[PDB]
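To close the chapter, one final illustration. This time we ask the reader to focus less on the individual chains and more on the assembly as a whole: which components sit near each other, and how the overall shape emerges from the parts.
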Amino acid sequence: AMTPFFWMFEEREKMFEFYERVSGARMHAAYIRPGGVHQDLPLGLLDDIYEFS
Amino acid sequence: ASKVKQDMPPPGGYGPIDYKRNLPRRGLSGYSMFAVGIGTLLFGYWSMMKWNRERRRLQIEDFEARIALMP
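The assembled structure is written out below.
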């Protein structure tokens, strides 16, 4: 089919941006730790997640 | 002094998010599509009938010119 690959990898890029904003790594994140999470969300992340979703 | 400030949803929450499938029907019956196809076929048949009869007449005229010139 080969078109939806690009169509949806744009959205995958946006979610990689979310990952990078929350942890600094696009896809090898290591954000979720065995005590919780490493860091708190940045102040404008929830709004952008809502806009994306 | 200053109160806590962290990433939290705004008061009243966020607006609703659509998640259901949305595949609207454009709208045309199978009967309608078949009718359109047959109608264009009939129009083409009629126009071709007229044009080919005219072509037959023209060919006959050319053959008459040849026959006149033959001797």
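The helical segments of chain A are 4-23, 45-52. DSSP finds two helices and two strands in chain A. With these observations in hand, you are ready for the problems at the end of the chapter.
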